[PDB]
């Protein structure tokens, strides 16, 4: 794997010795080049994995997430190029350094053949994010948001460390291959119940599960644009990836320990979808949409059937790309408007037609329109849950209808209607924003042609 990790590390000296007016160009070019290198990992085989060495291994679950992580960084740089114009060279270089460190930690996390190394990098991914949120944030609530994001995650993930070291003491190894091959059933006991809770809660808090999602709207609203996309696209998938990796040792306890979380997610999807309808903010609406989709992913993972896992992976990738696009569009609107309110600027389609087209495409993809991978993952999870129980279809259909409703409400309120009269600084959209939207959307419509690349190991 080192052919990927080493260039990401070399991105730091490359950035720090660049000229004052050429950091963005170099960072973007070499990030894109790195993404091309990461494409080779996608060719997985039906057998075990691509066991590179004793420390790193790649599966067909890690490959799509790794490619998405490597692809996101150029988009983050193009998004951050706007509001960092009046920033000193040292602070811009520090921002790029934080982004590069985040990418490096995520890359090392997603392979992480050993569970303790996975946990170490999984918590290491928390420092650059907190620095980005609390330093380059506009509102005065970024401090409280950073505190919430830190503590909600750390409180859940601290018992996970104890559970992992206990498992190593009893089992004798935490390597995922040995863990998978030597797995033994968990007896129904209070100690095993608490081991299950410790191993699960750390990933359920980050997903997030309904009832522990309070940190997500704050972190997404107060963060800068790049922090928002990296939170919505990749950082939410860490919990689901960890849960799908670690549910291999919790059987057969899960068969009855999944009921509270299944009920919480299947009701919180409806609750957050309804919340999206009555929202005065755009970024908050998108954050709640992300919560709903991640609740569906939680249900899929807890069902634990092959179709559930395939749909979960597809929905992970699709939601990451869609949420990143939606946050990009909201940021472009906010930069001209400087208000971040849904009804303050209206009828923008008459003034910016191409951005209206991008809004329509993003809303349609979020609406789970066929044959996009959004609906592929959605439908796989729906069929798996229907096999689990015939009554889930009611909740899932209600969620689908409310999702369509709030997506088209978001489109209509900001694009259709009569323009607001007292706003006269809606300049024509730059080439940077159009290119950003195109690079967000084209991979989705391209992946809809080859779904097997994002359907996970149980394909």
């Amino acid at each position: 794997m080192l052919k990927i990790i080493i260039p990401t590390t070399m991105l730091l000296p490359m950035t720090w010795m660049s000229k004052h007016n050429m950091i963005w160009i170099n960072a973007t070019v070499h990030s894109l080049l790195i993404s091309l290198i990461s494409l080779s990992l996608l060719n997985q085989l039906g057998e075990n994995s691509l066991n590179f060495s004793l420390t790193f291994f790649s599966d067909s679950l890690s490959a799509p997430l790794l490619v998405l992580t490597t692809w996101l960084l150029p988009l983050m740089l193009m998004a951050s190029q706007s509001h960092l114009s009046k920033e000193t060279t040292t602070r811009k270089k520090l921002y790029i350094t934080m982004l590069i460190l985040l990418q490096l930690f995520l890359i090392m996390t997603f392979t992480a053949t050993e569970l303790i190394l996975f946990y170490i990098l999984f918590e290491a991914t928390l420092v650059p994010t907190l620095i980005i949120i609390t330093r380059w944030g506009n509102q005065t609530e970024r401090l409280n948001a950073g505190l919430y994001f830190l503590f909600y995650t750390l409180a859940g993930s601290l018992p996970l460390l104890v559970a992992l070291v206990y498992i190593q003491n009893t089992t004798g190894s935490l390597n995922f291959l040995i863990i998978h091959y030597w797995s033994h059933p968990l007896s129904n006991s209070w100690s095993n119940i608490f081991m299950w809770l410790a191993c699960i809660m750390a990933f359920m808090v980050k997903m997030p599960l309904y009832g522990l999602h309070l940190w997500l709207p704050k972190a997404h609203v107060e963060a800068p644009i790049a922090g928002s996309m990296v939170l919505a696209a990749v950082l939410l998938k860490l919990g689901g990836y960890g849960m799908m990796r670690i549910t291999t040792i919790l059987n057969p306890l899960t068969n009855y320990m999944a009921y509270p979380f299944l009920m919480l997610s299947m009701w919180g999807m409806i609750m957050t979808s309804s919340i999206c309808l009555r929202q005065t903010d755009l970024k908050s609406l998108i954050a709640y949409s992300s919560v709903s989709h991640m609740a569906l992913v939680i249900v899929a993972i807890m069902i634990q059937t092959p179709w559930s896992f395939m749909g979960a992976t597809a929905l992970m990738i699709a939601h990451g790309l869609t949420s990143s696009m939606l946050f990009c569009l909201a940021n472009t609107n906010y930069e001209r408007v400087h208000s971040r309110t849904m009804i303050l600027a209206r009828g923008l389609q008459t003034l910016l037609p191409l951005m209206a087209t991008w809004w329509l495409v993003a809303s349609l993809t979020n609406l789970a329109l066929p044959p996009s991978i959004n609906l592929i993952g959605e439908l796989f999870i729906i069929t798996a849950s229907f096999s689990w129980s015939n009554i889930t279809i009611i909740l899932m259909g209600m969620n689908m209808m409310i999702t369509a409703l709030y997506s088209l409400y978001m489109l209509i309120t900001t694009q259709r209607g009569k323009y607001t009269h007292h706003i006269n600084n809606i300049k024509p959209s730059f080439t940077r924003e159009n290119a950003l939207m195109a690079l967000h959307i084209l991979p989705l419509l391209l992946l809809t042609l080859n779904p097997k690349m994002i359907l996970g190991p149980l394909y």
């Binding site: 004793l54 420390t55 050993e114 303790i116 190394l117 190593q168 935490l174």
Partner: protein, 57 residues
């Protein structure tokens, strides 16, 4: 015909020729417990390094 001992004579250490057998164990001590194995050998490099979590060296 007795000669008084001079200075430094009565404080001399002397030898006694006696037929009383030398006591073999005057302290009435028990048997000393067996010592530790104190094994020996040639050192070899640690098997698979430190074996501390994910460290391969």
């Amino acid at each position: 015909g007795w000669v008084r001992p001079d200075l430094g004579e009565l404080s001399k250490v002397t030898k006694v020729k006696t037929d009383r057998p030398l006591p073999e164990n005057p302290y009435h001590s028990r048997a000393r417990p067996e010592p530790n194995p104190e094994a020996e050998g040639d050192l070899k490099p640690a098997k698979h390094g430190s074996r501390l979590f994910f460290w391969t060296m």
